[PDB]
Amino acid sequence: MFEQFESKFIDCDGIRTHYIEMGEGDPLVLVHGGGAGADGRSNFADNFPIFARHMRVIAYDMVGFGQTDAPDPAGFAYTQAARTDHLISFIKALGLSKICLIGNAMGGTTACGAALKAPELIDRLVLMGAAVNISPDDMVANRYDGSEEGMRKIIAALTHSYQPTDDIVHYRHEASLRPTTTAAYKATMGWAKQNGLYYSPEQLASLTMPVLVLGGKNDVMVPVRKVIDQILAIPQAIGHVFPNCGHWVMIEYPEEFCTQTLHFFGKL
Amino acid sequence: MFEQFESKFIDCDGIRTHYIEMGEGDPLVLVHGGGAGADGRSNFADNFPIFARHMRVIAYDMVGFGQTDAPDPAGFAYTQAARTDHLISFIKALGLSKICLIGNAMGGTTACGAALKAPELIDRLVLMGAAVNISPDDMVANRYDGSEEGMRKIIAALTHSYQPTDDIVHYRHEASLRPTTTAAYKATMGWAKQNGLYYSPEQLASLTMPVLVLGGKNDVMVPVRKVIDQILAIPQAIGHVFPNCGHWVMIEYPEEFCTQTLHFFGKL
Secondary structure, X not given: OOOOOOOEEEEEOOEEEEEEEEOOOOEEEEEOOOOOOOOHHHHHOOOHHHHHOOOEEEEEOOOOOOOOOOOOXXXXXXXXXXXXXXXXXXXXXXXXXXXXXXXXXXXXXXXHHHHHHOHHHEEEEEEEOOOOEEOHHHHHHHOOOOOHHHHHHHHHHHOOOOOOOHHHHHHHHHHHHOHHHHHXXXXXXXXXXXXXXXXXXXXXXXXXXXXXEEEEOOXXXXXXHHHHHHHHHOOOEEEEEEOOOOOOHHHHOHHHHHHHHHHHOOOO | OOOOOOOEEEEEOOEEEEEEEEOOOOEEEEEOOOOOOOOHHHHHOOOHHHHHOOOEEEEEOOOOOOOOOOOOOOOOOOOHHHHHHHHHHHHHHOOOOOEEEEEEOHHHHHHHHHHHHOHHHEEEEEEEOOOOEEOHHHHHHHOOOOOHHHHHHHHHHHOOOOOOOHHHHHXXXXXXXXXXXXXXXXXXXXXXXXXXXXXXXHHHHOOOOOEEEEEEOOOOOOOHHHXXXXXXXXXXXXXXXXXXXXXXXXXXXXXXXXXXHHHHOOOO
């Protein structure tokens, strides 16, 4: 699946990193979510050609995910900081400046970290159901199971009223079972569950570029009150709340997602 | 001022009502806010030609305001219900069906009341810094003074970073001093202050058409947490929060206001 995009690879301080790209113009980098089997292609395949009309659009696979190196977790610590440095490494590796940058969930954690840690690379940031204020306790109070049904339950949970295709289910399911990424995933989520996916309101308010904050009203992973807290904690932030929408705005409402982001990026 | 628009008049169950209009297409009705000297023209003059490219755009003066009858408050009770029935009366008087409808503040109170009371007239509703959940106590806990400065202070209060022209100031100031509307205004605000501008969460959630909810993050009259409560109380509602923006979204960010509403109305 997804062979309409040419897989490319580049080295990011010794992490070999898979990415796809499409279109021409100013660079836009998309960061996928941190669910099991997640990667760039499957997260953003529907948005890619809409965005490619206006921008040079790039989705990469985060360390531990997709077809990017998933270093052995016996010697690699799967911390937010590693994700964050990988992204910065990636953006630099392609020689990109002044990017537009969008992150879903843990990918939002990561986009946010790069924006704070390396603002000179990033002109605009979009946080979309982004885990940027989820504490260990926040994860506690919220609350995989193997198989093709288990994956179908995941998807029905992260979405409001969206029926995935069989090809999509099977791609994600197979993906969740790749053994290197399954290990990296178990580490990634273990660390997240104990340390949370979290920046302080002070750090959030320290973001230096324009920011748009997106959220589905029915999202159960990053509930809408958390999205609101981000709109309110980040002074310059625009907020847009989608109704009848779970944790995958970009998949559940792809046209509206691309319209709002492209408008915010100044391409309409 | 505002003579680029042709003043028209029509009778609304014995209330003679001023309105302007422009463009061709599906009908869009705009409802001004309830500040002193407020009317359609001064509220919406900047948005009118943008909207007129796509729709038949109509701004009217609410009972007690502008150049619409301001019946003597010794015999006329200036209740939300009167505003609400006037609007319904107006929409029917021009023979309009399936309108798009936008209300600022008390005009939002009024648009909301018409949507609840006469849903068959209204295809889409936009509530923009709308007083639809402001209780007497809410007004208490928030907290005119005559002159051209007093009006300049009003405007600097309802806006974040907006410098009105001298012509605008003088038009509003003169307007606030018209004696029939000054009386109707004192009644209007007296009733509002004691009864509030308020529908219950149950009523709010009972709205039957699509709804977009707009708010400026810095609005001091209808604070942003009230705007959020409306996004959350109205299940189908889209929410958009503007940064660096007070209580007059349509004036402070006219292009973004027209873009979001026109997109929501399906004219882009």
